[PDB]
């Protein structure tokens, strides 16, 4: 059992009896001078949810938002969720003591959402993998979906 965490039964390895295995990604890039962002939750082949986010949204914030959405949609179910964000992983797994100086709203929302799934593992996966393994395909799908959502919104459709 992890220590100095927020949800005592949270693990970082896949649970055998998971209902859902999902992949999250937050995308942030510069376009026409401003920072743009998107977030997504996917399986290897399906987009469960993807949205463009407000201008100025950092990649870190987008990653928190994507992970939060996965937790919300998995309320009452057993979830393995993969993120390639070290920031989102650490925010979910390690409790901090001080006032949150950045992303305070998104951190609070994530911490609340941790408690929604019946059982939960938040797992790190490498990003930009070339394989056709489940993790490679899932992470790729989430990255593509988040970037597509962000691009479509900036271009207006």
What is the three-class DSSP state of 146? helix
Q: What's the chain's length in residues?
A: 157
Q: Characterize 66-104 residue by residue with b for buried, 16 or more Cβ atoms within 10 angstroms of its Cβ, and e for exposed.
A: bbbbbbbbbeeebbbbbbbbebbbebbbeeeeeeeeebe
Cβ closest to Mg ion, residue 111 vs residue 145? 145
Cβ closest to Mg ion, residue 86 vs residue 98? 86
Cβ closest to Mg ion, residue 21 vs residue 85? 85
**Cβ at position 118, least distance to Mg ion in Å:** 25
- Chain residues binding Mg ion by CB under 5 A are 25, 84-85
**Cβ at position 119, least distance to Mg ion in Å:** 24
The burial of 3, by beta-carbon neighbours within 10 Å (0-12 exposed, 13-18 middle, 19 or more buried), is given as: exposed
CA angle (61, 72, 41) in 5-degree steps: 60
Cβ closest to Mg ion, residue 16 vs residue 134? 134
**Cβ at position 63, least distance to Mg ion in Å:** 6
Cβ closest to Mg ion, residue 84 vs residue 135? 84
CA angle (76, 79, 81) in 5-degree steps: 140
**Cβ at position 98, least distance to Mg ion in Å:** 26
Strand order in the sheet with 47-53: 47-53, 34-42, 20-31, 78-83, 119-124
**Cβ at position 129, least distance to Mg ion in Å:** 12
């Amino acid at each position: 059992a992890e220590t100095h965490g927020t949800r005592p039964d949270l693990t970082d390895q896949p649970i055998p009896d998971a209902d859902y295995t999902w992949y999250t990604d937050g995308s942030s890039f510069l376009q026409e001078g401003q920072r743009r962002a998107g977030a997504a939750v996917t399986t290897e082949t399906e987009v469960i949810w993807a949205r463009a986010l407000p201008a100025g949204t950092s990649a870190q914030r987008a990653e928190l938002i994507a992970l939060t959405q996965a937790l919300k949609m998995a309320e009452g179910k057993k979830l393995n969720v993969y993120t390639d964000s070290r920031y989102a992983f650490a925010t979910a797994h390690v409790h901090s003591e001080g006032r949150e100086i950045k992303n305070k709203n998104e951190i609070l929302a994530l911490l609340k959402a941790l408690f929604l799934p019946k059982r939960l593992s938040i797992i790190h996966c490498p990003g930009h993998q070339k394989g056709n393994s489940a993790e490679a395909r899932g992470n790729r799908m989430a990255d593509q979906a988040a970037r597509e959502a962000a691009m479509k919104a900036v271009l207006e459709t």
